[PDB]
Write a protein that binds this ligand. Structure first.
Ligand code: CA
Ligand code: ZN
Ligand code: ZN
Length: 53
């Protein structure tokens, strides 16, 4: 029921959480952010990565 990610679709498949506390979206599908495997440490989504540089 809740929609997640930049794509605004329900949770499906492998999901990753952005570790920036102010991330507006928080939860993303792996594919929508270019991942194939679980991050081995903290992970920041592309939008938060752009905001942190
Ligand atoms: Ca949304
Ligand atoms: Zn998505
Ligand atoms: Zn984020």
């Amino acid at each position: 029921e809740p929609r997640y990610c930049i794509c605004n679709q329900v949770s499906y498949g492998e999901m990753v959480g952005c570790d920036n506390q102010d991330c507006p979206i928080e939860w993303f599908h792996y594919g929508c952010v270019g991942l194939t495997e679980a991050p081995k440490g903290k992970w920041y989504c592309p939008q938060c990565t752009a905001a942190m540089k």
